[PDB]
Design an enzyme around this catalytic site. Sequence first.
Site, PDB file in Angstrom:
ATOM      1  N   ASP A   1      -6.226  15.008   5.299  1.00  0.00           N
ATOM      2  CA  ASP A   1      -5.638  13.952   4.335  1.00  0.00           C
ATOM      3  C   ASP A   1      -6.887  13.087   3.903  1.00  0.00           C
ATOM      4  O   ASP A   1      -6.708  11.960   3.949  1.00  0.00           O
ATOM      5  CB  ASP A   1      -4.684  13.183   5.246  1.00  0.00           C
ATOM      6  CG  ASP A   1      -3.944  12.090   4.061  1.00  0.00           C
ATOM      7  OD1 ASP A   1      -3.937  12.446   2.930  1.00  0.00           O
ATOM      8  OD2 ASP A   1      -3.149  11.376   4.636  1.00  0.00           O
TER       9      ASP A   1
ATOM     10  N   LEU B   1      -0.111  -5.038   6.210  1.00  0.00           N
ATOM     11  CA  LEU B   1      -1.290  -4.607   5.391  1.00  0.00           C
ATOM     12  C   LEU B   1      -1.277  -3.703   4.707  1.00  0.00           C
ATOM     13  O   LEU B   1      -1.605  -3.450   3.487  1.00  0.00           O
ATOM     14  CB  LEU B   1      -2.590  -4.278   6.364  1.00  0.00           C
ATOM     15  CG  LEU B   1      -3.048  -5.327   7.352  1.00  0.00           C
ATOM     16  CD1 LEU B   1      -4.110  -4.940   8.100  1.00  0.00           C
ATOM     17  CD2 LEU B   1      -3.489  -6.492   6.514  1.00  0.00           C
ATOM     18  N   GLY B   2      -0.291  -2.449   5.010  1.00  0.00           N
ATOM     19  CA  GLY B   2       0.107  -1.395   3.942  1.00  0.00           C
ATOM     20  C   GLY B   2       0.731  -0.608   4.610  1.00  0.00           C
ATOM     21  O   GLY B   2       0.890  -0.395   5.672  1.00  0.00           O
TER      22      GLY B   2
ATOM     23  N   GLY C   1       1.455   4.172   4.064  1.00  0.00           N
ATOM     24  CA  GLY C   1       1.124   5.399   3.605  1.00  0.00           C
ATOM     25  C   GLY C   1       2.100   6.468   3.829  1.00  0.00           C
ATOM     26  O   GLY C   1       3.160   6.140   4.157  1.00  0.00           O
ATOM     27  N   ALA C   2       1.861   7.644   4.156  1.00  0.00           N
ATOM     28  CA  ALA C   2       2.948   8.687   4.233  1.00  0.00           C
ATOM     29  C   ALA C   2       3.247   8.640   5.657  1.00  0.00           C
ATOM     30  O   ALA C   2       4.384   8.822   6.153  1.00  0.00           O
ATOM     31  CB  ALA C   2       2.434   9.986   3.940  1.00  0.00           C
ATOM     32  N   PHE C   3       2.320   8.042   6.642  1.00  0.00           N
ATOM     33  CA  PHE C   3       2.561   7.769   8.006  1.00  0.00           C
ATOM     34  C   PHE C   3       2.819   6.647   8.423  1.00  0.00           C
ATOM     35  O   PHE C   3       2.204   6.188   9.473  1.00  0.00           O
ATOM     36  CB  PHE C   3       1.584   8.791   8.922  1.00  0.00           C
ATOM     37  CG  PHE C   3       0.889   9.928   8.006  1.00  0.00           C
ATOM     38  CD1 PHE C   3       1.510  10.985   8.095  1.00  0.00           C
ATOM     39  CD2 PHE C   3      -0.459   9.587   7.570  1.00  0.00           C
ATOM     40  CE1 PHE C   3       0.855  12.055   7.361  1.00  0.00           C
ATOM     41  CE2 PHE C   3      -0.925  10.721   6.802  1.00  0.00           C
ATOM     42  CZ  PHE C   3      -0.423  12.055   6.743  1.00  0.00           C
ATOM     43  N   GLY C   4       3.503   5.811   8.075  1.00  0.00           N
ATOM     44  CA  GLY C   4       3.939   4.354   8.554  1.00  0.00           C
ATOM     45  C   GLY C   4       3.307   3.349   7.963  1.00  0.00           C
ATOM     46  O   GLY C   4       2.700   3.130   6.856  1.00  0.00           O
TER      47      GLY C   4
ATOM     48  N   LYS D   1      -0.239   0.607  13.474  1.00  0.00           N
ATOM     49  CA  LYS D   1       0.158   1.264  12.657  1.00  0.00           C
ATOM     50  C   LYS D   1       1.487   2.009  13.225  1.00  0.00           C
ATOM     51  O   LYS D   1       1.472   2.581  14.424  1.00  0.00           O
ATOM     52  CB  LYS D   1      -0.728   2.897  12.264  1.00  0.00           C
ATOM     53  CG  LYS D   1      -0.049   3.665  11.176  1.00  0.00           C
ATOM     54  CD  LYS D   1      -0.887   4.923  10.721  1.00  0.00           C
ATOM     55  CE  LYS D   1      -1.700   4.504   9.679  1.00  0.00           C
ATOM     56  NZ  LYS D   1      -0.756   5.136   8.384  1.00  0.00           N
TER      57      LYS D   1
ATOM     58  N   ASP E   1      -7.413   8.012   9.634  1.00  0.00           N
ATOM     59  CA  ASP E   1      -6.191   8.783   9.525  1.00  0.00           C
ATOM     60  C   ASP E   1      -6.462  10.077   9.796  1.00  0.00           C
ATOM     61  O   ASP E   1      -6.225  10.935   8.849  1.00  0.00           O
ATOM     62  CB  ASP E   1      -5.541   8.455   8.347  1.00  0.00           C
ATOM     63  CG  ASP E   1      -4.602   6.980   8.369  1.00  0.00           C
ATOM     64  OD1 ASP E   1      -4.743   6.423   9.407  1.00  0.00           O
ATOM     65  OD2 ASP E   1      -3.816   6.739   7.439  1.00  0.00           O
TER      66      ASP E   1
ATOM     67  N   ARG F   1      -8.551   6.351  -0.111  1.00  0.00           N
ATOM     68  CA  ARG F   1      -7.518   5.579   0.710  1.00  0.00           C
ATOM     69  C   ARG F   1      -7.568   5.877   2.159  1.00  0.00           C
ATOM     70  O   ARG F   1      -7.215   4.889   2.853  1.00  0.00           O
ATOM     71  CB  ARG F   1      -6.060   5.740   0.065  1.00  0.00           C
ATOM     72  CG  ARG F   1      -5.488   7.082   0.690  1.00  0.00           C
ATOM     73  CD  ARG F   1      -4.194   7.325   0.157  1.00  0.00           C
ATOM     74  NE  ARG F   1      -3.691   8.681   0.648  1.00  0.00           N
ATOM     75  CZ  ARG F   1      -3.741   9.664  -0.545  1.00  0.00           C
ATOM     76  NH1 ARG F   1      -4.214   9.263  -1.604  1.00  0.00           N
ATOM     77  NH2 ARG F   1      -3.149  10.808  -0.088  1.00  0.00           N
ATOM     78  N   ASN F   2      -8.165   6.799   2.475  1.00  0.00           N
ATOM     79  CA  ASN F   2      -8.482   6.945   3.958  1.00  0.00           C
ATOM     80  C   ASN F   2      -9.875   6.782   4.362  1.00  0.00           C
ATOM     81  O   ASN F   2     -10.199   7.589   5.395  1.00  0.00           O
ATOM     82  CB  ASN F   2      -7.875   8.284   4.487  1.00  0.00           C
ATOM     83  CG  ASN F   2      -6.298   8.126   4.552  1.00  0.00           C
ATOM     84  OD1 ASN F   2      -5.605   7.268   4.773  1.00  0.00           O
ATOM     85  ND2 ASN F   2      -5.492   9.320   4.387  1.00  0.00           N
TER      86      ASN F   2
HETATM   87  C1  LIG Z   1      -6.224   0.498   0.374  1.00  0.00           C
HETATM   88  C2  LIG Z   1      -5.046   1.216   0.516  1.00  0.00           C
HETATM   89  C3  LIG Z   1      -4.423   1.388   1.945  1.00  0.00           C
HETATM   90  O1  LIG Z   1      -5.038   2.312   2.717  1.00  0.00           O
HETATM   91  N1  LIG Z   1      -3.202   0.493   2.632  1.00  0.00           N
HETATM   92  C4  LIG Z   1      -2.922   0.647   3.957  1.00  0.00           C
HETATM   93  C5  LIG Z   1      -3.252  -0.336   5.216  1.00  0.00           C
HETATM   94  N2  LIG Z   1      -4.673   0.152   5.896  1.00  0.00           N
HETATM   95  C6  LIG Z   1      -5.612  -0.582   6.774  1.00  0.00           C
HETATM   96  N3  LIG Z   1      -6.162  -1.717   6.216  1.00  0.00           N
HETATM   97  C7  LIG Z   1      -7.225  -2.119   7.112  1.00  0.00           C
HETATM   98  N4  LIG Z   1      -7.985  -3.421   6.807  1.00  0.00           N
HETATM   99  C8  LIG Z   1      -7.379  -4.545   5.843  1.00  0.00           C
HETATM  100  C9  LIG Z   1      -6.598  -4.465   4.608  1.00  0.00           C
HETATM  101  N5  LIG Z   1      -6.634  -5.785   4.301  1.00  0.00           N
HETATM  102  C10 LIG Z   1      -5.880  -6.120   3.103  1.00  0.00           C
HETATM  103  N6  LIG Z   1      -6.968  -6.622   5.101  1.00  0.00           N
HETATM  104  C11 LIG Z   1      -7.518  -5.847   6.187  1.00  0.00           C
HETATM  105  O2  LIG Z   1      -8.090  -6.203   7.297  1.00  0.00           O
HETATM  106  C12 LIG Z   1      -7.938  -7.963   7.755  1.00  0.00           C
HETATM  107  C13 LIG Z   1      -7.422  -1.701   8.453  1.00  0.00           C
HETATM  108  N7  LIG Z   1      -8.430  -1.991   9.409  1.00  0.00           N
HETATM  109  C14 LIG Z   1      -7.962  -1.043  10.331  1.00  0.00           C
HETATM  110  N8  LIG Z   1      -7.099  -0.373   9.867  1.00  0.00           N
HETATM  111  C15 LIG Z   1      -6.470   1.066  10.588  1.00  0.00           C
HETATM  112  C16 LIG Z   1      -6.716  -0.645   8.392  1.00  0.00           C
HETATM  113  N9  LIG Z   1      -5.914   0.067   7.751  1.00  0.00           N
HETATM  114  C17 LIG Z   1      -4.324   1.590   5.946  1.00  0.00           C
HETATM  115  C18 LIG Z   1      -3.032   2.027   5.003  1.00  0.00           C
HETATM  116  F1  LIG Z   1      -1.991   2.143   5.686  1.00  0.00           F
END
Ligand SMILES: *CCC(=O)N[C@@H]1CN(c2nc(Nc3cn(C)nc3OC)c3ncn(C)c3n2)C[C@H]1F
Lengths: 289, 283
Positions: free
Chosen positions: A133, A17-18, A20-23, A44, A151, A137-138
């Site tokens: 933080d 999914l994405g 950031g600084a912490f993984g 994460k 986060d 984005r958080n």
């Molecule tokens: C917006 C930029 C960002 O913070 N990216 C990364 C990934 N993060 C993240 N995303 C979701 N939900 C999500 C995003 N997408 C494209 N689909 C979904 O769900 C199917 C999420 N849900 C719980 N957590 C802890 C999430 N984190 C966090 C950043 F690292």
Amino acid sequence: ALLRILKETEFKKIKVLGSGAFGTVYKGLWIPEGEKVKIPVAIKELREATANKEILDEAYVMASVDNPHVCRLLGICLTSTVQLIMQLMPFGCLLDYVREHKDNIGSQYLLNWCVQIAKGMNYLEDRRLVHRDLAARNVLVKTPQHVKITDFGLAKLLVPIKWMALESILHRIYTHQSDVWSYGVTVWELMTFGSKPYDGIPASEISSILEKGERLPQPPICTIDVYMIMRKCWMIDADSRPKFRELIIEFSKMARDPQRYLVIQGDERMHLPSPTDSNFYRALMDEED
Amino acid sequence: NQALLRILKETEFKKIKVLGSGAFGTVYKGLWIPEGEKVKIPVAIKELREPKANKEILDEAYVMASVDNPHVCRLLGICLTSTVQLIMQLMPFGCLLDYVREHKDNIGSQYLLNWCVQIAKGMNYLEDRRLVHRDLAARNVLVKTPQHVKITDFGVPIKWMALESILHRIYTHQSDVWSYGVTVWELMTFGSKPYDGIPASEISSILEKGERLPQPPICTIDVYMIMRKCWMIDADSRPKFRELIIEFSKMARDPQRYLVIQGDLPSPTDSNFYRALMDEEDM
Ligand SMILES: *CCC(=O)N[C@@H]1CN(c2nc(Nc3cn(C)nc3OC)c3ncn(C)c3n2)C[C@H]1F
Ligand SMILES: *CCC(=O)N[C@@H]1CN(c2nc(Nc3cn(C)nc3OC)c3ncn(C)c3n2)C[C@H]1F
């Protein structure tokens, strides 16, 4: 008893999914031992190393939060990349949400998001927790009507200079009043529909321009009432900035007359969902109090 | 009121996998796609098998959508095309009937008795709302989590019906008490079929002559005493759901006294984990 220790064999990472600084965050599946179901989770993967007492002690505090607008850490698997497990947020982060829906967001949604983030931050302060933080984005979107701060407590690792208070950049002072600074920057991100703060300015220069009195500019949709709140979050004297308890009251007042305080082209066209649609969302995705 | 039932379009949800069928149609696992969004939200869809009969359906669907109890399933939405499609929350664990059959070597007395309490609580709510279930059975109790079950499908099951329902088509809350007794029998027998191999057309005869479902091997006489009282011919002599809650809750505080299971709950750690991920509704 608020943090589950998981085995490698009871969950699987399925899609990235994405980061950031912490993984790295994955959409994953939890497979309860003995059962046939697959339950979606977010995982994460961290990447810093220097203990099996450090991470757990902070994770326990992370798993102890209980506020509708604060994400709770749910589980952990101590492997080589430590994997933290939380609830899956189907809508993603608020930053991309506002960027992708910047032609569908009215003043009522924007101001209510500000209220909810302030409620989540006031909770953390009440619990003696410094975020360090806070940013658009958080903030995770559980439903378009319900956002949650994420986060927190990843201070076991490491900087978001352009969201940091001046005393944090210069002196590594992190307090609830420095969180108030980051809250102001977060509000700016939302009101600009996801613009990048100090776009094109190297991070090594932010403390210099802040010391000379430069601040983020007034977003076009902001009336002077809203921009004054943001400016007060960026005062050099941390004790002169507003408190999260006060931000809740002020933004809640503006949310009762949203078109007075935000000027958005086509606002009266977009409203909050009817009670019909909110009840439907909550039954399917958001049953908490 | 009217805002507790969402009218959906064909284009905002999709059936993806069949889960089963019952008396009135087929249940699918589906995905709801909110207009304007990119997300896919799992739902359960019941499509009936067979515009103004829709006025009948809607009037009952609103009542189905107005129920609100931690142990009662709520109807969430409806889509009126050719065959009517009803939308509710998806229960990843399925029903209680299949669950007890598949986990019958790992279910202790505390789980069984708490399920009895929760089903009784949901039925007591329906009586409070003056709603007669008419189809209570282990197959119509859904498992939200192993610790939390909910009653579903309101709005002929001869072997679950009270004698006055078979003979005279009388459906009351006290006839639901009969079906509750049979449901408890199903759970205590780990999913046995009631009156196995006896034609439905002959059930009313054996009931009139005093035959009843037998005592399950794990049932102590106190539990079987309750089940038998649910099957009294005089409907007003059967217990009430308010009383069944109290009695089964009492037994649930000393479960091994009332159920004898060879090899006889999750820690607060595991319950808190389940609820955060699957079951945030307040109870
Ligand atoms: C917006 C930029 C960002 O913070 N990216 C990364 C990934 N993060 C993240 N995303 C979701 N939900 C999500 C995003 N997408 C494209 N689909 C979904 O769900 C199917 C999420 N849900 C719980 N957590 C802890 C999430 N984190 C966090 C950043 F690292
Ligand atoms: C035990 C009796 C029975 O099996 N009746 C079938 C099952 N239907 C049904 N199932 C669920 N949950 C579910 C079942 N399976 C195999 N997987 C899941 O979850 C992924 C359910 N949730 C809501 N509704 C209305 C459901 N119905 C009904 C009969 F077809």
